[PDB]
Amino acid sequence: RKHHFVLVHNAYHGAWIWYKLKPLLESAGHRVTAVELAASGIDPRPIQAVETVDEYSKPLIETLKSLPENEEVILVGFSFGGINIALAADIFPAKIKVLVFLNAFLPDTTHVPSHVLDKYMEMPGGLGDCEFSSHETRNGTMSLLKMGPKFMKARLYQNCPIEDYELAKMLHRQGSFFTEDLSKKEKFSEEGYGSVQRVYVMSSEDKAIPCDFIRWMIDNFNVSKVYEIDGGDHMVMLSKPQKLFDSLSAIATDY
Amino acid sequence: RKHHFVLVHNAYHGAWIWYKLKPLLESAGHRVTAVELAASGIDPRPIQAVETVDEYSKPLIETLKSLPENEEVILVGFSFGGINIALAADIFPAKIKVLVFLNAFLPDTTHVPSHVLDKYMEMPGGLGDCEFSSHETRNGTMSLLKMGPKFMKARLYQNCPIEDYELAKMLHRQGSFFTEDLSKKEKFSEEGYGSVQRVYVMSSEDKAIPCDFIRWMIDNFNVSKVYEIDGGDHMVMLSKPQKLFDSLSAIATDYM
């Protein structure tokens, strides 16, 4: 059978990252919706205009809200999109058969929502030539970030065709992890987010989110299955689009 | 010898269209600058905030303005980018070694700047599922347009990998031809735009700008050479990126 995949991109990026995967899915007869979150991609809003993670995810929530009733989706969250889908699952858990965490941050149901993001930022190394900034909001300061080209090439796009790195340099935008908003947020519920089925999909060569951090997350909060994509970098939908399709196709079958 | 290519995209698109060509050029040892015009791509401005063609091209003019002194570029204008480069050539003619009109509107030095755009809009065919709109400005109404998916697929991306049509659907924005602003504008000068070296590069299968309209334009206003890319659609930098590279590489050699 065929399913409806809702694809949710990562921060500093947009729906455009799914341009290789979307036709592969649709060509197999699945329906695909590539959500464009706020201040992301060609969204007209600056990131300064998006002060809470809730506003950031609004387009995703809006997509599920207006979903034909009784329809269920495969919700795919890439990277920071993992927080987004957890957010959405806690509102519309019954519109989601399975949550797919693709090289994503996998939040738990026990600590503040920002937990795995904080534990991540505490890792040694820093972030290459990324540019940290701050922004005062109605509710304290919001931490902003824009990636640097060297950081992107070395830790996100190492296995991508050069065209895709170049394309990213032309499209990536300043964004946020909303670590501050998320720290003040009510923890994800077990009745909502917790009740939804969830699997993990990880690239074997993810240099943005270390394999061991990924394992600490899954350890911290179990999933039904863990699929691995051999040779994928962080941007596995650009480096290994076909293998990503194979993974999601296996997921669709299992669920 | 290696040159500095300045790439200027078309309306409703952005710098992102050059993602296949940029590395081909740079890999051959040319330097590449893919300008992002106003209200284009990930530019934070709505098109409603850009009321004149001058504002639209400002990033291009700004790029040439801050160019190292005595440096000359190969300025590539794609589609409506042809008007943009003609605009720029009329300001900084000496910073430009050759103008490359890629499936572009080639304005002359005789009629109002909007001329070839008007003559274009008068042609039968219409524009599929494109969405026409208007917008009141400080200087009368501005005509806006947003492409429709069917129109794009059939007349711009017919020869492109499906991924690139899908990518475009995710990135194209509402834009304008500034036909109204351009009609009120002083015609391009012969001392500026006219003095600069210009060639034409055309796709053999361009369904957005008909081969015969392209020939009427070149007829209307001659170029040094006309290169043809066999099998290219309108978006030739996405369908035939390597042949596009071959053409520009030939151009660089001829104007070396």
Numbering used by the authors:
A (entry chain B): 3 to 257
B (entry chain A): 3 to 258
In the authors' words:
Hydroxynitrile lyases (HNLs) catalyze the cleavage of cyanohydrins into the corresponding carbonyl compound and hydrocyanic acid. In 2007 a hydroxynitrile lyase from the noncyanogenic plant Arabidopsis thaliana (mouse-ear cress) was discovered (AtHNL) which exhibits high sequence similarity to the S-selective HbHNL (45 % identity and 67 % similarity) but quite unexpectedly was found to be R-selective for a wide range of converted cyanohydrins. Previously, S selectivity has been considered a characteristic feature of HNLs from the α/β-hydrolase family, and AtHNL is thus the first R-selective member of this fold family. The Ser-His-Asp catalytic triad is conserved in AtHNL and is crucial for catalysis, whereas HbHNL and AtHNL differ with respect to several other residues surrounding the active site.
The crystal structure of AtHNL shows a striking structural similarity between AtHNL and HbHNL, both in the polypeptide fold and with respect to the presence and location of crucial active site residues, for example, the Ser-His-Asp catalytic triad. The only significant fold difference between the two structures is observed in a loop at the entrance of the active site. The asymmetric unit consists of four protein molecules forming two independent dimers. Contacts between the two protein chains are mostly hydrophobic in nature but also include a salt-bridge interaction between Lys24 of one molecule and Glu165 of the other. The PISA-analysis on the interaction surfaces indicates that the dimeric arrangement is also likely to be present in solution. Specifically, the lysine residue crucial for stabilizing the negative charge on the cyanide (Lys236 in HbHNL) is replaced by methionine. In the modeled complex with (R)-mandelonitrile the hydroxyl group of the substrate is hydrogen bonded to His236, and also interacts with the amide group of Asn12. The cyano group is oriented toward the main-chain NH-groups of Phe82 and Ala13 and is located at the N-terminal end of the α-helix following the “nucleophile elbow” in the α/β-hydrolase fold. While the R enantiomer has the hydroxyl group within hydrogen bonding distance to a potential catalytic base (His236), the S enantiomer interacts with a main-chain carbonyl oxygen, which is unlikely to deprotonate a hydroxyl group. In contrast to HbHNL (and MeHNL), however, the latter is not accomplished by a positively charged (lysine) residue but presumably by a combination of main-chain amide hydrogen bonds and a helix dipole more similar to the stabilization of the oxyanion in α/β-hydrolases.
